[PDB]
Amino acid sequence: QTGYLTIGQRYQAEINDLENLGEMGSGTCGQVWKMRFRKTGHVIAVKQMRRSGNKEENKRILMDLDVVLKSHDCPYIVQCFGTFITNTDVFIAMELMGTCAEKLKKRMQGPIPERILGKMTVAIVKALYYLKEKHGVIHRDVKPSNILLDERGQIKLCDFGISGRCAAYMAPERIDPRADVWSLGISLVELATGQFPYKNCKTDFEVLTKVLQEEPPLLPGHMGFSGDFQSFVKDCLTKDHRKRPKYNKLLEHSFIKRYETLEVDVASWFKDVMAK
Ligand SMILES: *CCC(=O)N1CCC[C@@H](n2nc(I)c3c(N)ncnc32)C1
Fold it and tell me: Could you confirm whether 272 is annotated as catalytic?
């Protein structure tokens, strides 16, 4: 299905029906434009895959789109609104999110509150569990840059270009043969403290050295972090991949079950951080 913008209202449109409002971010999977649908006025994100582009980058863009299209019923994965195939380019209409957790960390200039990380943990775990269960997909790259938030308070994963069936969030069993949840724990410690636990390393291999040699970077106990938060991170940061719990066990954690029911005002916190 190409030439349709299903933003529950499907519009038979082309690429010329979108106004280019500038590029968002840089690099990563592909060139993402901020575009406005001239027919309705809605603003969406548009990935552009050039037919003449890098064959390795285009291979990841097509793999990401394959996962995104398969996940049209996962609330914690960015939805595709349609595609436009021309003789020169492929335009992938994605829903517009605010920013990634990495940029939230830089604009916050400090720790992100636990109540925000709780709603984020529930979203990312269910996203990874959805990719494993309904599709057999392993993310293989969970990082704050892959955790998007929006003005309404939604939290979703975005980049599946290297998934299958960066090195600083890599699990111990990936370096030396549930690896996606070690990356989630490293991301949680980073966002909960504002400091990356391996910022002292100067090379990629030195991070791999610290991951295997040093003890897991646990949460500090003097920042008011609840016991459920510290327990969930410790379970994620289990070095032996056999002792590390599966997704059906992590989804039953008290830290997960608490923020499934709790009402956290992520939307208001998001706009106040964006205004800083
Ligand atoms: C931290 C996020 C980031 O820098 N980045 C790279 C540039 C594109 C950006 N992004 N990718 C997608 I797919 C987006 C959607 N759907 N909305 C907003 N921004 C998006 C991710």
Answer: no
